């Protein structure tokens, strides 16, 4: 009945892909063209119902729509986990090197 919600989230798509509703912004560095600009924008306009919802962000240049399409298979969306998004923890989660 007492669960660690973060461990439980490691057993979702969250634990395999960049979760557009929950993952720290530093993740978007693992794929080219996405950090800092598109990443900043993805975090601001979250949350998302579907992975494809990010192609609907206002302000996108066609080059940017290109890069997101190029990478949607690296994305997923799960429900917002409060523990992961409160505290500004999507910009800085206390992890450095």
């Amino acid at each position: 009945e007492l669960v660690n919600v973060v461990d439980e989230k490691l057993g979702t798509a969250y634990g395999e892909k960049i979760d557009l509703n929950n993952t720290n912004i530093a993740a978007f560095i693992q794929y080219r063209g996405l950090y800092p600009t598109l990443a900043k924008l993805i975090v601001k306009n979250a949350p998302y119902e579907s992975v494809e919802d990010v192609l609907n962000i206002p302000g996108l240049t066609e080059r940017q729509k290109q890069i997101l399409r190029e990478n949607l298979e690296h994305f997923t969306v799960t429900e917002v986990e409060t523990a992961l998004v409160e505290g500004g923890d999507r910009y800085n989660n206390g992890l450095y090197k």
Partner: protein, 244 residues
């Protein structure tokens, strides 16, 4: 004529919200066809009251008063937000951003320290309908979010945490864990609070307003460890309005 940091530093006045002349009894009118934002909302607590736990049933304990032990670190300020005019003429303020939390610990009679995250986070506060003018009889009522006092990375004194730390009582390697499940598994609460903001002073020239507030929220639950207390906060507020 204003003050400078060096006039203030060390006074305590940095924790105080700005005040309005006792002359300011005018009113500030609202063009339903204009838009408006709150530039500075400043909320200054004066009183902290903690609900007691009445042991038996039909007693419903009272709000007793408390000592503050964390000094002049209590006030919310630099808060901005939209100020909408809804269809029926009510105004709704939607917090955006600001220094909108302060950790506070108060001590009740007996020794018990009560920590609490005093906040107006994600606050929406509305008026009655048909305003047309913010006056010294206006009331805002609304509700806000109270996240966990500690956030996900907080490690307890034995290294236990939610997004970090140990998952067990490592100092007791072959102790039966079922007892300690509550202290081993951390939980990130997210509750709601409520606030009334009564206007009692209005400079109609400048769009400044000021008055009194009362909010009710929950104290720290130490990431699941224990049950929270109920907290009533009273104080004074000051806000400034700008045609957006």
């Amino acid at each position: 004529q204003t003050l400078t940091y060096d006039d203030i530093v060390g006074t305590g006045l940095a924790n105080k919200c700005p005040t309005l002349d006792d002359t300011a009894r005018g009113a500030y009118p609202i063009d339903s066809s204009q838009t408006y934002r709150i530039a500075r909302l400043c909320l200054q607590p004066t009183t902290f009251l903690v609900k007691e736990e009445p042991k038996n049933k039909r007693q419903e304990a009272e709000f007793v008063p408390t000592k503050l032990v964390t000094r002049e670190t209590t006030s919310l300020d630099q808060i901005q937000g939209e100020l909408k005019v809804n269809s029926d003429g009510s105004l709704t303020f939607v917090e955006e951003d600001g220094i909108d939390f302060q950790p506070v610990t108060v001590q009740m009679a007996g020794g018990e320290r009560i920590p609490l995250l005093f906040t107006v986070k994600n606050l929406v506060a509305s008026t009655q309908p048909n305003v047309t003018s913010i006056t010294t009889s206006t009331d805002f009522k609304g509700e806000f979010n109270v996240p966990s006092y500690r956030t996900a990375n907080f490690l307890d004194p034995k290294g236990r945490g939610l997004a970090s730390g140990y998952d067990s009582a490592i100092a007791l390697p072959q102790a039966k864990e079922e007892e300690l499940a509550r202290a081993n598994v951390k939980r990130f609460s997210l509750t709601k609070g409520q606030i009334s903001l009564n206007v009692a002073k209005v400079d109609g020239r400048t769009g400044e307003i000021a008055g009194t507030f009362e909010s009710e929220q929950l104290s720290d639950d130490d990431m699941g460890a224990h049950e929270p207390h109920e907290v009533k906060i009273q104080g004074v507020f000051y806000a400034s309005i700008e045609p957006a």
